[PDB]
Design a protein around this nucleic acid. Structure first.
Ligand code: DGT
Ligand code: DGT
Ligand code: MN
Ligand code: MN
Lengths: 178, 174
DNA sequence: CAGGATCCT
DNA sequence: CAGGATCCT
């Protein structure tokens, strides 16, 4: 909200800096968050020229760690403060090159990954259309899975691309989703 | 600000004839559709606020009742306001007090009254007991496997006894 | 469309 | 225990 606007390139340099610097405390132990479990989402992934904030999705190996990842987040040698922080969303105000920016951290479990990536990539208008179409065929789609009568629909997929095509829609790269 | 029980009762009495909503038309809220709930109904000597449940004749009016609430002969402001809860800061005498307005549909009335009467500790026990027999109780109804359990009850007393619990007057619930 | 964190009810 | 309003995501 109050955070400064970033250029796409500014955002990419922040993500790159953070890729090696995130960690969390787990019952005392300090566990590094692997760069490969950090997916850049939001307008940055859609490669928009200006961004209101930086959105990172964190992929967590086991459900037991959800309690601990965002609520005990750490960033090596970066000045920041917490706006709000639960298990699924944490909003930080970070200091970067003498400016204050909003950094949004989200968590997905490994089995949720492609649904999460699809959700947090957006844009909002695109997701409303996609979900409404699935709603007319009696499905509910969210960031956790595809559902039918409050029951998980177990799709045999791994990637976002595979998800979208399994949902019965045309795949477009993030940049071309409107 | 904190109220005595009697202060609270005089506020409710004043408001009983003064609530209305728009909606183009201005519709009076009947005193008989206004139930005092919360610690006032439990007759606690001191209260943190005044809680009133408003009973709505039809579901189509939910959109309009609290979101277009009006009070004749009173100065106030809205804190927050949705279809189910509206919180007002009212001027009474020479003081500011919190007034909480809740809505229940007619078919929900006894569930709402039971919920908003409390106290919280009592409701947690009651609901946990029903949870062990696979029911869910809330302010809207009694449910089983995401299906409304159609008890044909009218009053709160009838509800509690139908739920299989001992009826106690609000003052003695704990 | 769908859901999350906060601070309540 | 179970859920609501606000302002986000
Ligand atoms: N389903 C759904 N998802 C949303 C909604 N708002 C945001 N999201 C998801 C998709 C977004 O790409 C992601 C990040 O939200 P942001 O508000 O940061 O928007 P985005 O990053 O797209 O642009 P911006 O930060 O404004 O440059 O969260 C919503 O109303 N519904
Ligand atoms: N199920 C449930 N009901 C609640 C909860 N908190 C409040 N309520 C309901 C029952 C309460 O009697 C009613 C009014 O809440 P209040 O916070 O105003 O407490 P109460 O009025 O009993 O005392 P006070 O207002 O503090 O004098 O709302 C809760 O956590 N769970
Ligand atoms: Mn963003
Ligand atoms: Mn109260």
């Amino acid at each position: 909200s109050g955070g400064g606007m970033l250029t796409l390139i500014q955002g990419k340099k922040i993500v790159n800096h953070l890729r090696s610097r995130l960690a969390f405390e787990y019952n005392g132990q300090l566990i590094k968050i692997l760069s490969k479990n950090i997916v850049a989402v939001g307008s940055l992934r859609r490669e928009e020229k200006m961004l209101n904030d930086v959105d990172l999705l964190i992929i967590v190996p086991e459900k037991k760690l959800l309690k601990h990842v965002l609520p005990n987040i750490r960033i090596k040698g970066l000045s920041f403060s917490v706006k709000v922080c639960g298990e699924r969303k944490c909003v930080l105000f970070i200091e970067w090159e003498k400016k204050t920016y909003q950094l949004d951290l989200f968590t997905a479990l490994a089995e949720e990954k492609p649904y999460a990536i699809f959700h947090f990539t957006g844009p909002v208008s695109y997701l409303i259309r996609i979900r409404a179409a699935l709603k007319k065929k009696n499905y509910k789609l969210n960031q956790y899975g595809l559902f039918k009568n409050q029951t998980l629909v177990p799709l045999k997929i791994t990637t976002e691309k595979e998800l979208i095509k399994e949902l019965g829609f045309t795949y477009r790269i993030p940049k071309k989703r409107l």
